[PDB]
Amino acid sequence: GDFLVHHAIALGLHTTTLILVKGALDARGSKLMPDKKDFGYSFPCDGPGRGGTCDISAWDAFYLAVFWMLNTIGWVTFYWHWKHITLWQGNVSQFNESSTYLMGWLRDYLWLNSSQLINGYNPFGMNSLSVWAWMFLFGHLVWATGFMFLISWRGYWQELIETLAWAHERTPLANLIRWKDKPVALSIVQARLVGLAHFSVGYIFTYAAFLIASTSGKFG
Amino acid sequence: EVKILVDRDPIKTSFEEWAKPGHFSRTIAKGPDTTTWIWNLHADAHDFDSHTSDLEEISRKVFSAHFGQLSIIFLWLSGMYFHGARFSNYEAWLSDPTHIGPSAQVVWPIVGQEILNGDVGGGFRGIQITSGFFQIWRASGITSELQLYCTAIGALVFAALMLFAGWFHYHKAAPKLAWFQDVESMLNHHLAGLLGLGSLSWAGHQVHVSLPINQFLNAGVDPKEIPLPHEFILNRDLLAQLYPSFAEGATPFFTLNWSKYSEFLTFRGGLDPVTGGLWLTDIAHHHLAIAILFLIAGHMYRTNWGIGHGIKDILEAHKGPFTGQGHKGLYEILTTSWHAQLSLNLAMLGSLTIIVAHHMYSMPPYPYLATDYATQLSLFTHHMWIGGFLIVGAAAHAAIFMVRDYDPTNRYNDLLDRVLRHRDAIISHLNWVCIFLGFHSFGLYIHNDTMSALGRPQDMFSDTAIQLQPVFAQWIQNTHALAPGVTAPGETASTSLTWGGGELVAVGGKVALLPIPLGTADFLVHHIHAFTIHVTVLILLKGVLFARSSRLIPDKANLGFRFPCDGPGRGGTCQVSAWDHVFLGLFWMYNAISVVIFHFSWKMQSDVWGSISDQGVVTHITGGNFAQSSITINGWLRDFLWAQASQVIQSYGSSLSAYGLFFLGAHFVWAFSLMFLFSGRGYWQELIESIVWAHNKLKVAPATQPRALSIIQGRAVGVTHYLLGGIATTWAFFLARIIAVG
Amino acid sequence: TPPQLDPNTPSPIFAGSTGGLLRKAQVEEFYVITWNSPKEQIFEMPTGGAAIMREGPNLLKLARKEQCLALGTRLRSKYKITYQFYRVFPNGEVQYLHPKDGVYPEKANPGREGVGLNMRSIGKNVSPIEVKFTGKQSYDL
Amino acid sequence: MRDLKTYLSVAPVLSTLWFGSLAGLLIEINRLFPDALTFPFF
Amino acid sequence: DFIGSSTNLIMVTSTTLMLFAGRFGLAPGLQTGDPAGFTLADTLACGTVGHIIGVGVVLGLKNIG
Amino acid sequence: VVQPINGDPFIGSLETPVTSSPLIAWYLSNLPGYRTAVNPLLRGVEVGLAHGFFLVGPFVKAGPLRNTAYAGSAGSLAAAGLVVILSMCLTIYGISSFKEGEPSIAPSLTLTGRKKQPDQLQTADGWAKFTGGFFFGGISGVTWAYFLLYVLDLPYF
Ligand code: CLA
Ligand code: CLA
Ligand code: CLA
Ligand code: CLA
Ligand code: CLA
Ligand code: CLA
Ligand SMILES: CC1=C(C/C=C(\C)CCC[C@H](C)CCC[C@H](C)CCCC(C)C)C(=O)c2ccccc2C1=O
Ligand code: SF4
Fold first, then answer.
1. C47 and A CB contact within 8 Å
2. Nearest-10 Cα torsion for A123, A129, A135, A137
3. I need a labelling partner for E12 at 20 to 30 A (CA). Which of A181, B308, C115, F65 fits?
4. Three-class SS of B563-601
């Protein structure tokens, strides 16, 4: 299991490296956009022409590499925490027989060690791990909210906020109130950043909650 | 008049167009300059409105395509009936339809997959099916594998028949536009003949086959020594001993003495206590009455003679209090746009599929369906997903109508113009009610989480806390529990037992639909459902209304229905197309139907499904934890997702290992989709050009130039893998759980 | 050429929509398009819906230039009429906008000058290090 | 048959034929030599 | 059947009154010898509707009274 | 029954039976948000009274200790806190929008077209008077409803 997860780790390092090195060396230009240096580091795209140039910047390479990085560190830390919680419990045989197949990671690590966590507040009471259950669900919520900005892109939101601006300018007793900053939707590269920020905040908070609650619910 | 209006041999049957690929268009019938050619070939494969710009050829194409789809459905039915014939325990299920898992699939013992053949029961090692086909076959009185085999050969015959019919109605003798554009005849026939005589002949089957055989099976009879249906038809003494109403004949019918036919066409409301399904006498009376209804309904429109209605004559003469001067021109757009009709028909067909799910869980029409909890869960889940998908397709095709098949110059409608004019009021108020609903449902859930985490369960939204009781649904349950006594005296019991009363139709050690209570959690989750539905409607109706023009892109109908964007300008126009709106409404349909089926599975596993003891107290699967745990998201994570997904992780080993496997793989593909939704074509094209350099350096450069997926195609692949992985995760979870507990 | 001097000409027959001049006309510039239609006919206006432009001169006030030019291209391609739109600031000073020489911009009229034009290939632009700590960018030398 | 051999020469038809043959080969090998984890034939 | 009974009388009268309401009354090719319209399709239509009314009234009379 | 806005069919609205009915145009014109002739302070007092008189309801009957003895005594303090929040909100709004001395940004003329005087609410000093009126009237209404909840006997909400 340590072999297999070390090769998963190698996959993560090599792939994050691939994305980042590819964005660094294609930062000055490529065959699809040889004038990329003139557009700066962070720019949205180069339009739909030439087939489509979504996420072509080196910033976008970074932004996808943060996903692959968080995946890589999630692997290294899942490996660490399960190996160590099985060492601390005593049953190293659990990891040695269960780390070689992924339903062992889903059952004997994520499902098993998250019982005392998600029972931080049940209908009939709560315990000291209530904050970690709440933070667990909070990290889930923002990790999912990042998907709004990553999956759902602009254009739908500008054409929504146009309707909202109409409604505010035609709603009685709110024509009195008018913005000073015209409420546009988030920019594209900005929304990739915001989705990545929600995503990473949720990743980090979720795993912090799970890794502290499970390791503090029993303490080895 | 409504003539036949066909032409002979419009298209030559040949494999010449099989050879040249992408023949059906101008920009694809040249050959692959790139690898985008393949994707654009499959994408525009059934876009018949793009191939040929006339409704005649389009209509012939979709007609023969419907014939191909019917051939496929008949072939699939032949497969199911045949797998029920030769690869099933249908006899052993008939002998004991409470402890024998319905199984009609056996795997081959090759790489250890033979363990998927489980101890379902009946001396049979196979996969426990969940299609409820065994329940249909007991509702039809089959009782033999010979009958399943011969109807499988018949369905193969009908598949060949439909394939030949598609070939004939495209290539040899195809209708022209005067045949499709007449719709009074199409409606008259699809009402009186398809749905009218269809229900009539099914009522005939039931009156002559299902009722006697099911009465015999309910009385207790080995299905081998049961008389065949043709013995009930021919031997009058037999069916007369079953129902003496047959002894008089049809002079009860023709003299309108139907009161004596109330031995086999009862209005006996409620469920059959012996088998947990509905009363097949009630169902035979149902299909008969529905046949009379649709038969008198299919004589409403004027086709060829003087009597009838014109749909144009109705719509152009329908003045009323709220914009009744409109409705003029709808006969024009609906008889000249297949996309309008496809949108409308998909909307109503998907809503009917959802109605079907909701009426099959609660009024289980087949015998021993309510106690096969896998069958009930799978049917509700399935038809819910199908309904949501079909509604989202209604969106897609409403949008495709709005872009392509919409001409205010020729085909003008007052109502659609009035909707497009104030469309911003529509989307603004719908956005508002979506925000309001998201808050006052999900924020109630968040308040519950916070209060239960702060140790303040007195401040939660629950029955033991601040109560948000569904007074209206509770009142409806109170009425319908008391309906058959005063309002519907012809019914001895209520239409369903989900309302209330001392009615709990257990067939064995299983419940089968006790009265479902409605507490604070049901209010909360029903408002979550209204919420998710309203957000789906927001996204989809918004794409529909803004398919043509907006304040952002006033020339969107020139860009097309399915285009990525209009560039990063105007801040950005990334998902401005109507295609992008249906692509997002797919995610929201996923969220909606997933929380719907979660509500269903938990509510039934906590308040309905369970065991019944010899003392008379019911022990549910989860144990009534829906009213206290399904008020918090931590309870959905703990008492539902973490708790019920124990059987799918312990599935490894027993038959359900595949459901274990299909859990994780589904978990993967969903995540695999996130490679597509989050990313963009530019990065992947540059990675591909580096790999193309690596291939040019070995003389292995392809001629079909490798291009990253189209932006729209990246989004399509993303939403496709996302729906597949999420839905297959839920399918594995549901089926493993409910086959391992009930 | 002299501009066309926007008069108070009539407007199309439209029942009103939620796509008009909200606040970008009250405090900022809004736009106005004039087209001579030979006959009265129906057309899909860019603010959503369908209006009926009158015979002879018509005038439609729109919120931004893209609405005006989208409608103008649809007019010139579908109804083959000659459009020309303006920009009217909320204090006045109506600006003639679309043709700017009488002839449409796809035709190389003389007199209009070269502005936004680099006499080099696109990949001979200097790198950002050359223009670093300078107000100029890599595409303005 | 002319232009049927061109259709059967097309990439998906040819891929499904090749992978059906190949999958049947692997399947029948695993029937003949099931549960293999070493190559002991040298 | 059983000609002369109530079930026959209040069905015959319904069928004939619907044929009359279509012939000389408010209710509504195929050139028949009839003076004013009322083709075979209209005849079958009025017969069908009169049978509808007849079934309805005979069974409303058999339910009560 | 539906009519384009003021006859003008190219402004983003419509004269409907909801926004243009005489009952609505009498109601939505004679309420303190649209009393454009009176000084902003009196109408701001009316707005604050109307918003503080009811804001105590949610805080007193649904608050964190509504089931204790300090139900109204704390819900009214919470409503006064929300009034002290919202007067601050209006204050920063008037500061960011109107600087010190500019003329009114309000609609100059009415629907008919007569040269109505500009609404002084949309000025700096005018919105400042509106802020003061809202604060005073809001604390006034909160304390008045606190008086009424324990003085006058109701079956409550
Ligand atoms: C063997 C008999 C035969 C022959 C030689 C032809 C020949 C032709 N047909 Mg006809 N056709 C036939 C049978 C036949 N057809 C039948 C049985 C139907 C009814 C469905 C039709 C309906 C039909 C329509 C509606 C149209 C044609 C058209 C054409 C032409 C283009 C063919 C092409 O490129 O598509 C080759 C395509 C295939 C081989 C794909 C087969 C798809 C089948 C039906 C469904 C299989 C789905 C499968 C079960 C699900 C996928 C599973 C997978 C994921 C594993 C060509 C002249 C087109 C034409 O001339 O218009 C310009 C046209 O529009 N045909
Ligand atoms: C009362 C006669 C009648 C009946 C029964 C039907 C039945 C059907 N029609 Mg409709 N149709 C009719 C008259 C009728 N039609 C008329 C008069 C017109 C011209 C206005 C049309 C025009 C029309 C179109 C344009 C389309 C249909 C389609 C369909 C099918 C929808 C799929 C379905 O529900 O599957 C239920 C499946 C079955 C009941 C199995 C069918 C098996 C039998 C053999 C066929 C039904 C009888 C049929 C009319 C053929 C008569 C004999 C033939 C040799 C001449 C369904 C089979 C759609 C379709 O699926 O395309 C193929 C479609 O696209 N029909
Ligand atoms: C009655 C049902 C019906 C009908 C007749 C149509 C017909 C059509 N649709 Mg609509 N549609 C429907 C339902 C329907 N759709 C539903 C339910 C949805 C919601 C998802 C949509 C959403 C939709 C969109 C968003 C678009 C269309 C488009 C089209 C057109 C071209 C489709 C094409 O060529 O793809 C040919 C077929 C394919 C490319 C195959 C699709 C592969 C699917 C998605 C994968 C799923 C298969 C399976 C479940 C997964 C496991 C597979 C396994 C092998 C691993 C055609 C007019 C397109 C159009 O008109 O644009 C101009 C378009 O953009 N449809
Ligand atoms: C959990 C993840 C998540 C969340 C919370 C949201 C939230 C939202 N989406 Mg998004 N979306 C997501 C994932 C998510 N989305 C994904 C993955 C997709 C993929 C396609 C989309 C696609 C999408 C579209 C296409 C649309 C939305 C819409 C909406 C809104 C509808 C509900 C609403 O406003 O009610 C109120 C807000 C909520 C229910 C959100 C949660 C907030 C909770 C209730 C508590 C708030 C606490 C309070 C404010 C205190 C804050 C702290 C303080 C310190 C300030 C809302 C902003 C719709 C929209 O914007 O129009 C209405 C819409 O059209 N979403
Ligand atoms: C990439 C990772 C990987 C690896 C290394 C393996 C490796 C293996 N798997 Mg696993 N497997 C994998 C992924 C992997 N699998 C995945 C992703 C799945 C899910 C789809 C499975 C599912 C799975 C199952 C369910 C089973 C295996 C089995 C096996 C074994 C194969 C035995 C066999 O039939 O080969 C025998 C050799 C061949 C088929 C090759 C024959 C090639 C032809 C005949 C040409 C060779 C001759 C040629 C002409 C040269 C001669 C030289 C000269 C004279 C010319 C082997 C240990 C089986 C097993 O025994 O379990 C251990 C088994 O039951 N695997
Ligand atoms: C959005 C859903 C929702 C709802 C309904 C509630 C409701 C409540 N929360 Mg909870 N809460 C939520 C989400 C929600 N919460 C979330 C998302 C979080 C965490 C992010 C919390 C965290 C939380 C804590 C930590 C606490 C509460 C508390 C409370 C209570 C007091 C609120 C208060 O101070 O009253 C103030 C309320 C108002 C000012 C509302 C006025 C709205 C009016 C009624 C609207 C009227 C509109 C009108 C009909 C318009 C048309 C008419 C007009 C034209 C006249 C109340 C029961 C407290 C508690 O425990 O008490 C039980 C508490 O301490 N909440
Ligand atoms: C992964 C990814 C890609 C790269 C995906 C590739 C190019 C498509 C997958 C193509 C397959 C792998 C091609 C090989 C199949 C051939 C038919 C060859 C068969 C022969 C053997 C391999 C069997 C994108 O182009 C993209 C574009 C826009 C947004 C997101 C993404 C995105 O996430
Ligand atoms: S979809 Fe967005 S990121 Fe992609 S090309 Fe268009 S504007 Fe650029």
1. no
2. -40
3. B308
4. CCCCCCCCCCCCCCCHHHHHHHHHHHHHHHHHHHHHHHH
Q: Identify the burial level of F150 via C-beta atoms within 10 angstroms of its C-beta, where 0-12 means exposed, 13-18 middle and 19 or more buried.
A: exposed
Distance CA B93, CA B107 (A): 19
Q: How many of the other CB atoms lie within 10 Å of CB of B42?
A: 11
Distance, C-alpha B347 to centroid of its chain: 11
CB distance B530 to B523 below 8 Å: no
- Nearest-angstrom CA–CA distance, A73 and A9: 8
Query: Which of B332, B528, B549 lies closest to B434 in space, CA to CA?
Result: B528
User: What's the start-to-end Cα distance of chain F, in Å?
Assistant: 39
Pick from F132, F134, F137, F141: which is nearest to F57 by CA? F141
Chain breaks in chain D (C to N over 2.5 A) after: none
The phi, psi pair for C30, rounded to 5°, reads -130, 170
Q: Is B663 exposed, middle or buried (0-12, 13-18, 19+ CB in 10 A)?
A: buried
* Cβ atoms of residues F102 and F90 within 8 Å: no
Calpha distance B346→B387 (Å, rounded): 9
By DSSP bridging, strand B125-128 and strand C92-96 are unpaired
Q: Which of D19, D30, D31 to mutate to test the pocket of ligand 5 (most atoms within 8 A of CB)?
A: D30
Q: Provide the H-helix boundaries in B305-422.
A: 311-315, 330-334, 338-362, 373-403, 414-421
Cα dihedral B610, B611, B613, B616 sign: positive
Whether residue B36 contacts residue B710, with contact meaning beta carbons closer than 8 Å, is answered with yes
Q: How many other C-beta atoms lie within 10 A of the C-beta of residue B230?
A: 10
Tokens matching residue B548: 């043509």
D39 touches chain B (CB under 8 A): no
How far is C-alpha E15 from the chain's CA centre? 2
Resolution in A: 3.2
| Angle at which helices B578-607 and B373-403 cross, to 10° | 160
B499: left (phi over 0), alpha (psi -120 to 50) or beta: alpha
Judge: C19–B548 Cβ closer than 8 Å, yes or no.
no
User: B466: which DSSP letter?
Assistant: B
H-only helix segments in B190-235: 197-205, 211-219, 229-234
Rounded Cα distance between D28 and B110, Å, is 8
For chain C, first and last CA: distance in Å? 33
Q: Is A183 exposed, middle or buried (0-12, 13-18, 19+ CB in 10 A)?
A: exposed
DSSP B387-414: HHHHHHHHHHHHHHHHHTS--TTTS--H
Residue A47: count of CB within 10 angstroms of its CB: 16
Whether C46 sits inside 8 A of B554 (CB atoms) is yes
Distance (Å, rounded) from C-alpha C72 to C-alpha C83?
6
Q: How far is CA B535 from the centre of its chain?
A: 20
Q: Residue B404 and residue B547: Cα distance in Å, rounded?
A: 10
The C-alpha atoms of residue A205 and residue A213 are separated, in whole angstroms, by 12
User: CA triplet B225, B230, B236: central angle to 5 degrees?
Assistant: 95
Q: Which residue is it, tokens 């139900």? A: F71
Residue B615 DSSP one-character state:
S
Amino acid identity, residue B430? L
Facing residue for C42 by CB, picked from B412, B548, B554: B412
User: Which residues does chain B have within 8 Å of residue A67's beta carbon, measured at their own beta carbons?
Assistant: 674, 678
Can you tell me the distance from the alpha carbon of B555 to that of C98, in angstroms, rounded to the nearest whole number? 17
Q: Could you tell me how far CA E8 lies from the centroid of its own chain? A: 12
Pocket of ligand 4 from Cβ distances under 6 Å: A 141, 144-145, 147-148, 151-152, 156; B 431, 434-435, 438-439, 442-443, 446, 535, 538-539, 584, 587
Based on its alpha-carbon atoms, the radius of gyration of chain E, rounded to whole angstroms, reads: 14
Provide the 10 A C-beta neighbour count for residue D37. 5
Q: Which DSSP helix (H) or strand (E) runs through B471? A: helix B471-486
